[PDB]
RNA sequence: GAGAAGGUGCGCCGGCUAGGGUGAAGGAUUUACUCCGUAAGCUCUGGCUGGUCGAAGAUACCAGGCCGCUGCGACUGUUU
RNA sequence: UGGUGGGGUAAAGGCCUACCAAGGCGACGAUCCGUAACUGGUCUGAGAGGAUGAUCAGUCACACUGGAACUGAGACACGGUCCAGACUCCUACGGGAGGCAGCAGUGGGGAAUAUUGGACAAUGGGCGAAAGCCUGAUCCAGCCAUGCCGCGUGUCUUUAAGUUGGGAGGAAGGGCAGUAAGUUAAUACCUUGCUGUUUUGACGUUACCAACAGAAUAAGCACCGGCUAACUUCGUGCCAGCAGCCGCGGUAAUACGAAGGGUGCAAGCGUUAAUCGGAAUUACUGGGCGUAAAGCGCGCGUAGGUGGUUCAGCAAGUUGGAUGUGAAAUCCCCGGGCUCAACCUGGGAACUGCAUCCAAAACUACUGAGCUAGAGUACGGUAGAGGGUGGUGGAAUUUCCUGGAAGGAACACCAGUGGCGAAGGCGACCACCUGGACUGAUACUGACACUGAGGUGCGAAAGCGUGGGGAGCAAACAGGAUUAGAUACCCUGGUAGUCCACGCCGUAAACGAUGUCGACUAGCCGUUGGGAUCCUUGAGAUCUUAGUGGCGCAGCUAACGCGAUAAGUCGACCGCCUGGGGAGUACGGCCGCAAGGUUAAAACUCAAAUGAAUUGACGGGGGCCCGCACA
RNA sequence: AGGGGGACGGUUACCACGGAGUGAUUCAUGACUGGGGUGAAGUCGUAACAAGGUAGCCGUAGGGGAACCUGCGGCUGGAU
């Protein structure tokens, strides 16, 4: 069966990043919608598109660079099994800090830059690089 | 192999068995010669080597190589044992050290005098 | 196999106590070669507790000795 | 294991007790079994860790061995008593005594470890009004390169060492005889704390300063074939030997024995041993499984691991701060000192930890109401070697006999890179009692979920049960032909067996040598079952799905090759692997009537076995061709 | 006088050591055996690697001096 909601979306776009398709649609949750909103603010994707009907869905409009697109890999860290609840002193600066390292906290599912300057740690979700 | 299966049954690091059945974490161990005799090497070489059989003070029945080019270890000596596996001799893993108690010492042996038992 | 091997209790007198079987002072009726159950009496088997006497309590008569390797015949039986 | 009555401990408590009840512990590993003081820490490490408890400090534990109390504030007491045991000793045979794991020391074991030392002067203690008195604790000395530092063996200095002359610091105070104080009822007087002087007491007796004679008193070790840039010969000749891995030696030896030189770093240099490391070689960080080692043969599913979807709530995990600590030591920096370094300390840093406290609500668990996607059912319709029972068959072949009579067994074609079942598996014809999926939709459920150690069924055939059958073949064999020989393939013959009913074994080249499940990422060509689209006569396209195949990119792969039925990208979980032999074997458990199966080791031994791929060679490998090679 | 209260007594439970019977579970040893490893290889041999001169291999029964053969289901890790 399917066992993890957001690892099912982070896999399904990377094989579409190496494919020639642009609009990815899947049955989505609020959990998958709160993740999608933060990396369009980091310049990676745009227009998450809650379908706003019954069985609501996410149409993430991923951008292309010329040739190889903008997101090489999305590495899951906290999958559901070993779920990597991590503090604020130990946040991962993924690729020198050029990965933004989104971490689920109480006051927001938020990048590692604002996770440290307002100090709450928690679920280190995925590599965005 | 997964982290669930590690909490169920964790990965046991397998121990490495030691090379010497005797010398129970001891750098030397005294023995008494049962028998000194002659042994042939392994097939791609050919020679005549002289090995000893000893009973140790741990009561163990192993073979040690008399590493001299001449010795007077006369069938009941009190020879002292180090480790090290002589390659060409099969199945044996010990050496008699030179100049210990009853090991007289190799004649002249003018270099490496700390090895083969020479004064000065 | 096995009653393997080995062990413990055992007389008598009390104290307390659990029942079982038979029975009827009279009541139900099928007013009798019958049911219920009084009660005592009689009888059978317990359990717990003391006490007590002797060298000794299945005190006599009566009443398995046991164990370990083996050969042969499987076994109960039959025979000069 | 609780409950009460009592009993009892300095103190709670089945701790002890009587009786009441049938609870308690344990798959998060009980109980039994082997092993070991534990920790601050220590050692290797990038760290994670791994190994580890010698000096140092905390706690524990023991005192020949065992039981036991006593006294005391405190013991079940190391130089106490009692009892028992083992041992040992003195006897004048009456009676007695001893316990070094206290400091020396002795045997004895072992590779291996020290002096029958000096003094309470410092620091403690133990008694004391005080003086002090004792202490093998201590302060401190011989012995040992055992580390860790420094230092010296000369480039005409004299350091060390030695001779001599000097020379602090370890001493805080005690005696005393005034001097002042304040308890005093009487600073009369004692007793005490203060003041200044005098008297005195150092185990190590010196460090340390400054003279003197003169280079007189000081170097050794291992290697030199490689990847270690230290790299002639002489003797020796597959001898003698060296070595960690290759190897070297079989007659000019850079590999082995000297000399002759260098080089490593030095009062030490080396090699034996043990630890971690490189070792991603047990991979949490951070590995594997089609063919190298490795997917149970697959199911149903217990604990468990993880769990679609939304609001609200909780605050267990998660997150921040607060406070106590996390002892001191060690370590990490800044220092202070020994003339310098060790060493010594001062300051902090560090101690990733622990509970308590308040604050947070994105996510997880939990709680509640839901939502329809996952999953299930009500409705046909076919497809289908599902599977089983009973029959009805046919030709051969076989066996008889005058073309018929007789019975066994597998069912040519239909047959398919087809169906069906979780899997193993399964085809003449025929009914009869029965499965699960597909699909067409229409209805409803409200995650009911997948996976799953144990656990539980179910699994090809030879088997051997417990009963029958009977054709061909054929395990078992006899010869026939054949070879040194057949014990072989070929030749003539045949019981067990396949079949049946129940039952057992539970084996596999159970193989797709690929666990189950879901999600998603270019395709293209056949082929199976539905269904809908289709100008429609189908000769059929397209589309839609659930299977079964071909080929191919992206993709991965060691390569072969996989390639939406992954061997990709992932996610949950499970089984499994740790070099080749020994070995799927011994021993123990379980099952079987037996054959055996299942779980499953080390001892030893080897530096390699293995995987795909390439060149060459080889082939009683194929296919073409050449030449009197064949007439 | 004595009483109270102690002390030695008497014997009752508790128990270490010891005893006995019968078992477990471990360690060493054991005549004699059975494979295993490494050697050096004398030997019947040719069993595998080519279509290895009878294609190999696996399970299993069954059978035979050996390195080995048939059968039934099995697999190409099988090629012309």
Overview of the structural elements:
- Chain B: This is Small ribosomal subunit protein uS12.
- The structure is cut from a larger assembly and holds chains A (129 residues) and B (120 residues).
- In chain A, 20% of the residues lie in helices and 19% in strands.
- Chain A is an alpha+beta fold and 129 residues long.
- In chain A, the strands form two sheets. Chain A has a four-stranded antiparallel β-sheet with strand order 4-7-5-6.
- The longest helix of chain A has 10 residues, at 30-39.
- Chain B has one helix at residues 3-8, and strands spanning 29-39, 49-56, 61-66, 80-82, 94-96.
- Chain B has one domain (4-117): OB fold (Dihydrolipoamide Acetyltransferase, E2P).
- With 120 residues, chain B is mostly beta strands.
- In chain B, strands 1-2-3-5-4 form a five-stranded mixed β-barrel.
- The chains hardly touch.
- The structure holds three RNA strands.
What tags apply to this protein structure?
part of a larger assembly, 2 chains, A: 129 residues, alpha+beta, 4-stranded antiparallel beta sheet, 3-stranded antiparallel beta sheet, 4 helices, 7 strands, B: 120 residues, mainly beta, OB fold (Dihydrolipoamide Acetyltransferase, E2P), 5-stranded mixed β-barrel, 5% helix, 26% strand, RNA-binding, Small ribosomal subunit protein uS8 (chain A), Ribosomal_uS8_CS (chain A), structural constituent of ribosome (chain A), ribonucleoprotein (chain A), ribosomal protein (chain A)
How would you briefly describe this protein structure?
The PDB classes it as ribosome. This is part of a larger assembly, with chains A (129 residues) and B (120 residues). With 129 residues, chain A is of the alpha+beta class.
Beta content of chain B: 25-35%
How many angstroms separate the termini of chain A? 28 Å
Spatial gap, N to C terminus of chain B: 61 Å
SS-derived structural category of chain A? alpha+beta
Q: What is the CA-based Rg of chain A, rounded?
A: 15 Å
User: How do the strands line up in the largest sheet of chain B?
Assistant: 1-2-3-5-4
| Total beta-strand segments of chain B | 5
What's the oligomerization state?
A: part of a larger assembly
Which geometry of chain A do the CA atoms define? globular
The outline of chain B comes out as: elongated
What is the count of structural domains of chain B?
1
**Total DSSP helices of chain A:** 4
What is the C-alpha radius of gyration of chain B, as a whole number of Å? 19 Å
Q: How do the helices and strands follow one another from N- to C-terminus of chain A?
A: HHEHEEEEEHE
What portion of residues of chain A belong to β-strands? 15-25%
By CATH, the superfamily of chain B comes out as: Nucleic acid-binding proteins
Number of helices of chain B: 1
PDB class: ribosome
Keywords: Ribosome, Pseudomonas aeruginosa
Entry title: Pseudomonas aeruginosa 70s ribosome from an aminoglycoside resistant clinical isolate
Chain A: 30S ribosomal protein S8
